[PDB]
Structures are given as structure tokens and as C-alpha cells.
């Protein structure tokens, strides 16, 4: 009698776990909407990251040694370096930042969550004064090297200030995931010990 | 055995009953202080 009643107490633990599993069913919906947002946003970033690897050494190395940089390359490279903590507007600082062999590694490392809102607004303003620039003269033939990196630079801003819309979303997701994963570990334990 | 878990459930109900019985003691304390006030006040009214 007592053993049946204690299996029933394990099942009451399982029922608290199940009000929590009802919370877990209420989930999937939030992840589906978040993954829809991610499919809208992230895929071009992955394409840009792959294209950065596709970039050949010759294309960048020949153009770094150039005596004068074309205006489109300057306009698109200054903002990229603004990401790299080396905020500057001089060509020689660009050359020094790009010379080192440690620039083949962080073409992918840069994340969209590190940008500061003021710099992001500065970059929208630079977009407004440079809207005909960027991907259009990438398509034209400005340079083969710029293309992948320039398209990488024009991105990371559609994530910023709209990841802050996902920040409360992902925080609620983390809370629900923690509660539901603890409760589902409880669920497996309860099933095993029933 | 079904009736064994039935007994579990009815005891659970008797445990809520014991919670109500604990709620009691409070009633006895309040009634005791009220009846002390009543003994202080009402007895001359009964004499009258």
C-alpha cells in the first residue's frame, strides 16, 4: 500500500514536472519564431563568412601595397576598421592593420553583439552619405578582394538593434530552457524510478 | 491495491483536515481572550 502511494508521490513530483512540461509545450513556439528571425537574418552572414575564406591572398596583398586607395575602398574599409578597435581615418593605419598575418584569422571572429549603439548609428549615417557605395560598386568591379569583406561589413548592422529585440526573447528562452531542462531531467529520473 | 491508493488519497484529505485542526488553536486563543473580556463586562448585566 505504502509503496504504491510512494510511486504516487514520485508521480506527484512528476505532475509538478508536468505543469512544467505544459510550460515546455508552450515553448517550441518561441524557438520557431526566433529561428524564423534567424533564417531571415543570419544566412547572409554565413555566406559572407564563407566568402571571406574564399578570398585569395593575392587580391588583398596586391591592393594593400597600392600607392593610392580608390574612394570606394576607403569608404568601405574605414567602417570595417571601426569594428577592429583601431578607429582611424588614415590610409597608413589601415595598411599597418592589414599587413600582419593575424588578419586572416579574425575575418570571421568578429561578432554582431560587440557593436556599440553609437557606432552603429554612426554607420547608418555613413550608409546614408554612402548609399550608392558598397555592394553596388562591389558588383561593378571595384576589386575582387573588397567584395566578400564589404558585404560582410554592410551586414552585422541588420543584426544590431534588432538582436536587442531578440535579447528579451532569448532571455525568456534561457529561463524556459533552464526550467524545462531541469524538469525533463526530473522527467527521465521519474520515469526510470517509476 | 486500487483501494490502497484510495486510502492514500483519503488520508491526504485527512491531512488537509489536520491543517484545519491546526487553524483551530487560533480560534481557542481568540475565543479565550474574548470570553475574558465578556467575563469582565457582561456579568453585572446578567445580575441587573
UniProtKB/Swiss-Prot annotation, chain B:
Q: Which cysteines are joined by disulfide bonds?
A: none
| Domain of life, per lineage | Eukaryota
Subcellular location(s): the record lists: Cytoplasm, Cytoskeleton
Primary role = Cytoplasmic dynein 1 acts as a motor for the intracellular retrograde motility of vesicles and organelles along microtubules. Dynein has ATPase activity; the force-producing power stroke is thought to occur on release of ADP. Plays a role in mitotic spindle assembly and metaphase plate congression.
The subunit field of the Swiss-Prot or TrEMBL record says:
Homodimer. The cytoplasmic dynein 1 complex consists of two catalytic heavy chains (HCs) and a number of non-catalytic subunits presented by intermediate chains (ICs), light intermediate chains (LICs) and light chains (LCs); the composition seems to vary in respect to the IC, LIC and LC composition. The heavy chain homodimer serves as a scaffold for the probable homodimeric assembly of the respective non-catalytic subunits. The ICs and LICs bind directly to the HC dimer and dynein LCs assemble on the IC dimer. Interacts with DYNC1LI1; DYNC1LI1 and DYNC1LI2 bind mutually exclusive to DYNC1H1.
Q: Spell out the family assignment given in the record's similarity comment.
A: Belongs to the dynein heavy chain family.
Q: What is the disorder linked to it?
A: Charcot-Marie-Tooth disease, axonal, type 2O: An axonal form of Charcot-Marie-Tooth disease, a disorder of the peripheral nervous system, characterized by progressive weakness and atrophy, initially of the peroneal muscles and later of the distal muscles of the arms. Charcot-Marie-Tooth disease is classified in two main groups on the basis of electrophysiologic properties and histopathology: primary peripheral demyelinating neuropathies (designated CMT1 when they are dominantly inherited) and primary peripheral axonal neuropathies (CMT2). Cortical dysplasia, complex, with other brain malformations 13: An autosomal dominant disorder characterized by global developmental delay with impaired intellectual development. Some patients show signs of peripheral neuropathy, such as abnormal gait and hyporeflexia. CDCBM13 is associated with variable neuronal migration defects resulting in cortical malformations.
Q: What is known of its domains?
A: Dynein heavy chains probably consist of an N-terminal stem (which binds cargo and interacts with other dynein components), and the head or motor domain. The motor contains six tandemly-linked AAA domains in the head, which form a ring. A stalk-like structure (formed by two of the coiled coil domains) protrudes between AAA 4 and AAA 5 and terminates in a microtubule-binding site. A seventh domain may also contribute to this ring; it is not clear whether the N-terminus or the C-terminus forms this extra domain.
What name appears for this protein in its UniProt entry? Answer: Cytoplasmic dynein 1 heavy chain 1
Taxonomic lineage: Eukaryota, Metazoa, Chordata, Craniata, Vertebrata
What gene does this protein come from?
A: DYNC1H1
The range of the complete sequence contained here reads 3244 to 3291 of 4646
Amino acid at each position: 500500500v505504502k509503496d504504491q502511494q510512494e510511486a504516487e508521490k514520485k508521480k506527484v513530483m512528476s505532475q509538478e514536472i508536468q505543469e512544467q512540461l505544459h510550460k515546455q509545450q508552450e515553448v517550441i513556439a518561441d524557438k520557431q519564431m526566433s529561428v524564423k528571425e534567424d533564417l531571415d537574418k543570419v544566412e547572409p552572414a554565413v555566406i559572407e563568412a564563407q566568402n571571406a575564406v574564399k578570398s585569395i591572398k593575392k587580391q588583398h596583398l596586391v591592393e594593400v601595397r597600392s600607392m593610392a586607395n580608390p574612394p570606394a575602398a576607403v569608404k568601405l574599409a574605414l567602417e570595417s576598421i571601426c569594428l577592429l578597435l583601431g578607429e582611424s581615418t588614415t590610409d597608413w593605419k589601415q595598411i599597418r592593420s592589414i599587413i600582419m598575418r593575424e588578419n586572416f584569422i579574425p575575418t570571421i571572429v568578429n561578432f554582431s553583439a560587440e557593436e556599440i549603439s553609437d557606432a552603429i548609428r554612426e554607420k547608418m549615417k555613413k550608409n546614408y552619405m554612402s548609399n550608392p557605395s558598397y555592394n553596388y560598386e562591389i558588383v561593378n568591379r571595384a576589386s575582387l578582394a573588397c567584395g566578400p569583406m564589404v558585404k560582410w561589413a554592410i551586414a552585422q548592422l541588420n543584426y544590431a538593434d534588432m538582436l536587442k529585440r531578440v535579447e528579451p526573447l532569448r532571455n525568456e528562452l534561457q529561463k524556459l530552457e533552464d526550467d524545462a531542462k531541469d524538469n525533463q531531467q526530473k522527467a527521465n529520473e521519474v520515469e526510470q524510478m517509476i
